[PDB]
Amino acid sequence: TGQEMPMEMADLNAVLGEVIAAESGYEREIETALYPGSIEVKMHPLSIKRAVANMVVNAARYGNGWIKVSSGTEPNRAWFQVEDDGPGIAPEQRKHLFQPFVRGDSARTISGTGLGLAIVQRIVDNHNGMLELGTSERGGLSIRAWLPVPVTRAQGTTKEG
Ligand SMILES: Nc1ncnc2c1ncn2[C@@H]1O[C@H](COP(=O)(O)OP(=O)(O)NP(=O)(O)O)[C@@H](O)[C@H]1O
Numbered sequence: 581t582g583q584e585m586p587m588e589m590a591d592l593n594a595v596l597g598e599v600i601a602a603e604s605g606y607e608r609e610i611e612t613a614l615y616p617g618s619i620e621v622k623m624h625p626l627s628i629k630r631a632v633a634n635m636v637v638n639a640a641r642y643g644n645g646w647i648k649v650s651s652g653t654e655p656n657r658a659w660f661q662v663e664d665d666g667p668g669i670a671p672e673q674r675k676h677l678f679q680p681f682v683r684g685d686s687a688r689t690i691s692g693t694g695l696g697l698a699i700v701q702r703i704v705d706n707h708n709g710m711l712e713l714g715t716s717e718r719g720g721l722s723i724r725a726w727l728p729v730p731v732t733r734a735q736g737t738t739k740e741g
Contacts, residue, residue: 586626587706592619592658592727596651599632603649608640611663614651619658621727623707631703632662635723639664655734659709659726668718677713 593614600612632649639647643666651660669677678701704711710726 586624587622588624589620589622589730590625590628592621592623592628592651592653592660594619595623595625595628596632596649596660598625599629600649603633603636603640603647607644608636609645609647610636611646611648612650613648614660615653615658617653619651619653620732621658621707621709621729623727624703627703627706631700631725632660634699635662636664639666642666655736656732657709657726657728659724661722661724663720663722665719666721668715668721669713671718 596612596614600610604610636647636649643664645665648663649660650662651658653659678698680701701711704725704727707727709728710724712724713721714724715721
């Protein structure tokens with residue numbers, strides 16, 4: 581009990597630093613490398629917090645060679661990416677990785693009734709930024725999540741001549 585306003589203005593380096601101190605308790609070889617300055621995106625520190633955790637849970641339990649949590653940003657668009665060692669995505673699964681949008685006139689559902697815990701997807705989906713997956717030779721997988729910032733005022737230096 582105590583108010584509950586979600587999706588608001590939050591720093592991406594501030595939310596990741598919270599999940600870092602939480603996921604860094606015993607061998608969670610998490611290499612932190614956030615934008616050394618100050619990010620700023622209106623997001624939900626909750627959903628995002630869970631989005632970074634469930635991401636390392638796959639490299640910590642099965643994986644155990646190296647985990648990496650980094651965050652960057654740009655003018656009118658900040659984002660954060662992760663990296664972990666392991667086998668990487670499969671050759672066939674790369675095509676069926678919880679991809680949204682379908683194309684067909686029939687689904688042919690045989691079974692699979694229960695709950696729908698698609699965490700992570702609704703996260704970047706509730707922000708409206710981006711979500712992509714990459715892998716270097718199925719050896720160095722890295723996640724690319726984006727979070728667009730609300731209108732701002734950043735021009736930079738520009739001489740007239
Ligand atoms: N670090 C990763 N991040 C995102 N996708 C990954 C990663 N490593 C592998 N993948 C691919 O996505 C799947 C792993 O994460 P995820 O998509 O959550 O699993 P899932 O098979 O869809 N559900 P489950 O594995 O039962 O928890 C694998 O089947 C790979 O094809």
